[PDB]
Amino acid sequence: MSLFSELPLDAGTDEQITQIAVSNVSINPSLAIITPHKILLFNECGEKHDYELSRNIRCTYVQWHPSQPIIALGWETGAITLWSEETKVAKEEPNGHKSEICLIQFNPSGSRMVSADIDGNVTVWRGINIVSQYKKEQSITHAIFCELNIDSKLKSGNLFFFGGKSGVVCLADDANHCSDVCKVGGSIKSLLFYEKENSVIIITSTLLLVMFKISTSVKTGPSKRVKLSISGDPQKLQSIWIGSCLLATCSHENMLRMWHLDQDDNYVLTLHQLAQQTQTQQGAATVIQSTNTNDQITSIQYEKRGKVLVAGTREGRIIFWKNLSIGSESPLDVDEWKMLPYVSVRQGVNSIAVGQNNGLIAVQYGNQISLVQETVINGKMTDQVRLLQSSANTIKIYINNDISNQVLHFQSKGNIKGLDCNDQFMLLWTSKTIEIHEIIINPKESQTKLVASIQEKCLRSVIHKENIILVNDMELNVLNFKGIQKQNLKFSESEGKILNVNVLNNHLIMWTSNNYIRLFDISRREVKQIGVTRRFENSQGQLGQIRYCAVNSDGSKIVITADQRGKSGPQADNKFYIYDVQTDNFLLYEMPAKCIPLQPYCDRKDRKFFGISCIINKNIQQEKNADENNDENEDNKSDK
Amino acid sequence: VCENMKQYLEAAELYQKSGMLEKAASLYIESKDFKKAAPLISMIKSPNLLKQYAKAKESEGAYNEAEQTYEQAESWEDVVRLNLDKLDNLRKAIAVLRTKCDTSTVCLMVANVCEKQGNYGELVEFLLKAGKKEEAFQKAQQYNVMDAYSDNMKDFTLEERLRIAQYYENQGIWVKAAKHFEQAKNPTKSLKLYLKAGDQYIDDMIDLVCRNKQQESLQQTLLDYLLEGEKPKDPIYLLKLYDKLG
Numbered sequence: 001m002s003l004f005s006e007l008p009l010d011a012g013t014d015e016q017i018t019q020i021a022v023s024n025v026s027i028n029p030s031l032a033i034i035t036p037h038k039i040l041l042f043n044e045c046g047e048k049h050d051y052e053l054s055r056n057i058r059c060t061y062v063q064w065h066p067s068q069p070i071i072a073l074g075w076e077t078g079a080i081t082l083w084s085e086e087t088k089v090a091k092e093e094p095n096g097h098k099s100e101i102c103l104i105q106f107n108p109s110g111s112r113m114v115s116a117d118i119d120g121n122v123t124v125w126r127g128i129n130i131v132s133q134y135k136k137e138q139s140i141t142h143a144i145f146c147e148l149n150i151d152s153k154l155k156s157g158n159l160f161f162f163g164g165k166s167g168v169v170c171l172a173d174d175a176n177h178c179s180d181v182c183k184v185g186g187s188i189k190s191l192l193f194y195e196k197e198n199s200v201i202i203i204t205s206t207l208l209l210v211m212f213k214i215s216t217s218v219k220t221g222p223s224k225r226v227k228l229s230i231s232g233d234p235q236k237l238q239s240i241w242i243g244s245c246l247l248a249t250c251s252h253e254n255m256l257r258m259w260h261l262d263q264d265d266n267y268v269l270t271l272h273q274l275a276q277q278t279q280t281q282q283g284a285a286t287v288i289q290s291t292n293t294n295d296q297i298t299s300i301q302y303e304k305r306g307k308v309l310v311a312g313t314r315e316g317r318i319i320f321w322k323n324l325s326i327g328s329e330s331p332l333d334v335d336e337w338k339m340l341p342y343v344s345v346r347q348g349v350n351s352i353a354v355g356q357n358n359g360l361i362a363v364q365y366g367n368q369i370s371l372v373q374e375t376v377i378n379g380k381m382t383d384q385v386r387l388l389q390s391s392a393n394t395i396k397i398y399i400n401n402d403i404s405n406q407v408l409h410f411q412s413k414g415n416i417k418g419l420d421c422n423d424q425f426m427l428l429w430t431s432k433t434i435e436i437h438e439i440i441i442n443p444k445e446s447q448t449k450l451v452a453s454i455q456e457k458c459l460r461s462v463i464h465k466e467n468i469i470l471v472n473d474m475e476l477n478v479l480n481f482k483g484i485q486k487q488n489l490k491f492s493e494s495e496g497k498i499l500n501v502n503v504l505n506n507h508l509i510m511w512t513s514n515n516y517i518r519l520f521d522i523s524r525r526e527v528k529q530i531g532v533t534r535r536f537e538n539s540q541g542q543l544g545q546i547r548y549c550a551v552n553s554d555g556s557k558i559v560i561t562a563d564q565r566g567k568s569g570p571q572a573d574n575k576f577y578i579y580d581v582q583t584d585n586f587l588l589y590e591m592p593a594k595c596i597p598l599q600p601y602c603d604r605k606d607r608k609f610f611g612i613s614c615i616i617n618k619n620i621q622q623e624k625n626a627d628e629n630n631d632e633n634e635d636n637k638s639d640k
Numbered sequence: 641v642c643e644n645m646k647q648y649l650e651a652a653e654l655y656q657k658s659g660m661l662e663k664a665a666s667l668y669i670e671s672k673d674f675k676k677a678a679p680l681i682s683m684i685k686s687p688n689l690l691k692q693y694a695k696a697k698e699s700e701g702a703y704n705e706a707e708q709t710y711e712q713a714e715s716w717e718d719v720v721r722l723n724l725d726k727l728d729n730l731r732k733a734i735a736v737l738r739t740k741c742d743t744s745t746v747c748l749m750v751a752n753v754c755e756k757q758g759n760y761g762e763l764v765e766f767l768l769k770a771g772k773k774e775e776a777f778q779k780a781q782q783y784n785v786m787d788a789y790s791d792n793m794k795d796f797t798l799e800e801r802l803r804i805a806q807y808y809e810n811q812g813i814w815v816k817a818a819k820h821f822e823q824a825k826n827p828t829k830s831l832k833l834y835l836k837a838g839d840q841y842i843d844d845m846i847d848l849v850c851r852n853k854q855q856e857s858l859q860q861t862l863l864d865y866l867l868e869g870e871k872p873k874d875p876i877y878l879l880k881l882y883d884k885l886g
Binding site: 492535 | 825
């Protein structure tokens with residue numbers, strides 16, 4: 001299912017590092033190191049950038065733009081700086097604040113920002129300019145934008161809630177309208193927001209979850225005060241939002257506590273799975289100490305794109321969990337969660353940082369840093385050519401000969417990100433560069449030669465005939481073997497961002513983030529857009545959010561598996577869609593809820609034939625069996 | 641077998657007499673037997689059969705029957721397409737667009753229908769409702785209808801305020817361009833161009849003083865400009881604004 005690639009890095013600094021940050025850009029991520037004196041910037045390759053942003057003013061906080069490479073820096077004097085790396089431009093505000101900035105947060109759209117200091121002053125910024133200022137008692141730990149289920153005319157993204165050790169929570173926005181809710185109290189550790197119920201989740205040191213319910217004109221006290229039986233340190237407790245409504249809590253203890261709000265179900269993940277892994281791994285000449293499976297976990301971080309939860313034990317073990325549940329809905333029990341092989345670390349892990357670039361992880365232990373990447377098992381099919389990415393560098397090539405099936409093992413310089421082939425060539429694209437290989441087939445042995453290597457940056461590269469189409473999140477261009485740009489085509493901003501592409505025969509298809517589907521023909525030497533852009537919208541209403549797409553041989557039929565996101569409700573949607581280019585309609589196929597479609601596959605040569613993989617929802621079958629069997633069924637004899 | 645080889649209608653009467661009539665109705669709406677298929681459309685409410693029947697109606701040339709068929713089938717994009725074809729009833733089209741919660745694609749289609757008007761203002765409001773605000777930007781400024789589109793988009797983005805400003809200024813109007821300048825959240829530019837504005841606008845500039853107290857060059861340069869402005873004027877207004885300054 002997946003492999004983990006760990007890359008140790010050389011800090012090369014005498015000063016002890018303090019903070020680590022990872023960029024959230026979808027392509028070519030970067031990481032930042034904050035020390036008491038210097039501010040270091042590293043690329044994905046792990047080398048020191050020539051430009052240095054270290055300044056006389058001490059740096060105390062750094063934040064990344066959720067979808068842009070722009071970085072935000074906050075000093076000890078309250079001044080803020082906004083820096084664009086790609087163009088190397090800086091814009092600083094001298095009178096940002098009169099006290100040291102504690103935490104910096106960005107709204108999901110990146111339009112607004114909130115800066116809070118220890119004295120209690122909180123300023124909301126539209127971009128880089130001051131809009132509204134608030135004075136509050138005592139320091140505020142964090143502030144997060146909130147979107148209550150309010151009418152459209154009263155709906156605005158400037159609403160936010162700030163929580164701190166003062167125990168006072170008030171609604172505020174850039175319009176200087178402060179709605180003082182206050183209430184609660186104590187040393188509040190963390191605050192979270194829930195959209196559908198407009199719920200404020202408060203975690204304090206009193207081991208008491210507070211699920212506050214708030215209305216626009218009505219104030220309501222906490223309906224339930226959830227008590228924690230936590231043996232660990234209450235101060236070190238941290239909770240994270242997993243899935244739609246799951247809460248994952250850890251307090252420097254061996255136990256991971258998961259709470260489900262819909263039925264208020266509590267379950268626990270242990271480290272005896274690590275004991276099983278040690279049993280299944282300590283079966284050869286391996287130097288591993290005695291199994292201490294009661295170890296505590298320091299940091300837990302979840303990545304949604306990879307669906308990977310990373311937890312760090314204090315003895316130097318990094319454990320991975322995978323959300324096998326289909327759809328954005330949270331897991332309901334322990335069965336859905338899967339446990340992945342761990343990573344051995346020399347010393348106890350201290351910090352874990354997650355960046356939304358294929359789930360990039362920055363791991364810090366002591367004064368040492370390292371990078372962790374997730375590689376999905378990629379498999380490519382063309383006539384006579386089967387390509388498998390078993391590991392980071394090892395590539396398995398299968399050739400079908402009537403006398404026997406031939407297997408070749410190819411070793412690369414380092415990790416390889418993606419592979420493609422077109423019956424004649426093998427094109428591999430990694431983080432560093434892109435390479436093309438010509439494979440020679442002979443019964444005695446098969447020899448592969450690298451035709452060329454180009455140091456170009458792109459997300460996906462599809463090779464056909466003699467040219468390669470490169471696609472980036474906003475554009476697509478054509479390249480030849482020499483490296484000239486015949487054509488490049490752009491997109492609009494609101495149609496979405498290119499996430500993944502599919503190619504078959506001489507037709508390629510891509511779907512953006514806003515449920516927009518584009519179809520292109522590559523039979524001509526220059527790719528041409530066929531038809532017009534089509535939103536995944538029906539006349540009655542929107543069908544949902546696209547998950548997976550497939551194209552048949554001729555290109556007339558397109559299979560779509562999508563999730564409708566039923567607002568903390570039904571498990572996605574177990575009904576799929578078929579789109580015909582001629583009629584421009586979306587026929588809907590309904591299949592029994594016993595299974596949920598996962599990913600479609602279209603036949604290579606036959607137009608009418610295709611196949612669909614389905615995950616069997618074990619929970620609902622057991623629930624239905626329990627409901628049905630408890631009716632006039634007692635003591636059935638024999639054959640059971 | 642007989643419908644597979646060549647004979648469609650006879651298979652349809654056989655279907656009707658065999659107790660299964662859905663495909664018989666489909667073949668009637670496929671063939672030229674709409675008079676017999678009208679009761680079939682009457683008692684059964686299959687939406688796909690309704691859409692195919694409306695396609696047959698627009699093929700034969702009947703515009704009102706197909707319009708009503710698409711109206712009762714909830715497929716109202718085909719309604720505006722048929723209005724394009726023959727009806728050209730843009731008022732009722734706009735009413736349907738407002739009532740039925742149009743999306744971005746239907747917004748592009750109604751932009752297309754407005755393209756055949758020569759005014760393009762309705763295109764401006766329709767694309768404002770669309771949210772497709774990049775090519776609409778250049779179409780609005782290119783057709784010299786920038787005023788209303790900018791009036792609506794003055795609350796969404798500010799990365800391209802300068803070209804809006806320059807293109808609106810060359811039109812010959814400065815009364816509304818100045819208000820756009822003030823609202824564009826650019827204090828230094830707004831003040832430096834209310835320097836060139838008349839005496840009547842200064843009050844609004846004074847209101848900006850109430851809104852932007854961070855700067856201080858605005859009041860000073862306003863004072864400097866009014867000191868030597870023409871001959872002496874009413875001192876009461878000047879002392880009022882001085883007292884407002886502090």
